[PDB]
Amino acid sequence: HWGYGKHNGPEHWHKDFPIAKGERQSPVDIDTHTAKYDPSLKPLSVSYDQATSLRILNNGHAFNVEFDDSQDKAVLKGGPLDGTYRLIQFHFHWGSLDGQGSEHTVDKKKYAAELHLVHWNTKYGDFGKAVQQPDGLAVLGIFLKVGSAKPGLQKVVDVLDSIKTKGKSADFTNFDPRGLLPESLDYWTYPGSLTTPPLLECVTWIVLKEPISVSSEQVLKFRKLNFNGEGEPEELMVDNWRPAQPLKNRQIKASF
Ligand SMILES: O=C1NS(=O)(=O)c2ccccc21
Ligand SMILES: O=C1NS(=O)(=O)c2ccccc21
Ligand SMILES: [Hg+2]
Ligand SMILES: [Zn+2]
């Protein structure tokens, strides 16, 4: 049932998922003046050279580009992370207007969209067990702004036509996630959660400072996706973002 509508949106999620009012929920606002530079942070390492994409799926909430995570290929490590985290999927959250769409905010600024690259900690064997641990997941968050087009995003954009409605999927091999990254790997990091039900508090968040630019046209095609299933009345897939949540007893560290 959960969604982003008036009757099933983020303000309703606590009823089925009481952790929504928890101690380390995501996303959060990033107060750049309060974040502290942490010399203890080691160099971040994003190694997506051997990434193997498999499929793209419309799950009724976003679209997921899924990877083969059966062995050590696309992995995130270093920075605040202990050990190696394996890429399982990526997805976006975006708005109905360029003025909104991101989940994390920076000094209350909302970007047009936000990319989440999801990885699980290989010490726990698989995703499922990973989401039972306080350090089971690492998510690399990247902001999207509207300006020039992102060439590495365009294969994603052109397949969306084929997964318009909930439950549809298409083959999506040989997609290179390195084309979605910005030049800089400066980031903010804090302990947090999934931004969607079940909102599990297992995530080390790594939010890149430098946004990637995407074209109006590319994000506009995102907004053509549907929340509903085929043959059902059209509910455009937009504003699938959760607003910022109480920082509570947490500190945000800067790698720069
Ligand atoms: O996320 C959603 N799921 S839904 O199709 O019930 C819906 C309707 C309107 C706005 C958002 C949403
Ligand atoms: O939608 C979500 N945004 S997130 O990156 O926190 C995440 C992690 C795992 C599964 C789903 C999702
Ligand atoms: Hg957890
Ligand atoms: Zn997400």
Secondary-structure blueprint:
Layout (H helix, E strand, L loop, with lengths): L28 E2 L5 E2 L6 E4 L5 E6 L4 E5 L7 E4 L5 E11 L10 E2 L6 E9 L5 H4 L6 E10 L7 H6 L9 E3 L15 E6 L10 E6 L3 E3 L1 H7 L30 E2 L2
Parallel strand pairs: 1-8, 2-15, 10-13, 10-14
Antiparallel strand pairs: 3-6, 4-5, 4-11, 5-7, 6-7, 7-9, 9-10, 12-13, 12-15
The protein binds 1,2-benzisothiazol-3(2H)-one 1,1-dioxide (LSA) (2 copies), mercury (II) ion (HG) and zinc ion (ZN).
Zinc ion (ZN) binds next to strand 7.
PDB class: lyase
Keywords: ten stranded twisted beta sheet, lyase
Assembly: monomeric
Describe the structure.
The chain is mostly beta strands. The chain has a single domain (1-256), classed as Alpha carbonic anhydrase (Carbonic Anhydrase II, Roll). The protein contains three helices and 15 strands. Strand 6 and strand 7 (84-94) form a beta hairpin. The radius of gyration is 17 Å and the shape is globular. Zinc ion binds next to strand 7. It is classed as lyase.
| Helix vs. strand class | mainly beta
Helix share, percent? under 10%
Question: What is the count of β-strands?
Answer: 15
What's the CATH architecture? Answer: Roll
Which of globular, elongated, flat, extended, rod-shaped describes the shape?
A: globular
Per the CATH scheme, the topology name is: Carbonic Anhydrase II
Instruction: Name the helix and strand elements from N-terminus to C-terminus, one letter apiece.
Output: EEEEEEEEEHEHEEEEHE
Task: Tell me which ligands are bound.
Answer: 1,2-benzisothiazol-3(2H)-one 1,1-dioxide, mercury (II) ion, zinc ion
Largest sheet: 13 strands, mixed
The Rg value, from CA coordinates, equals 17 Å
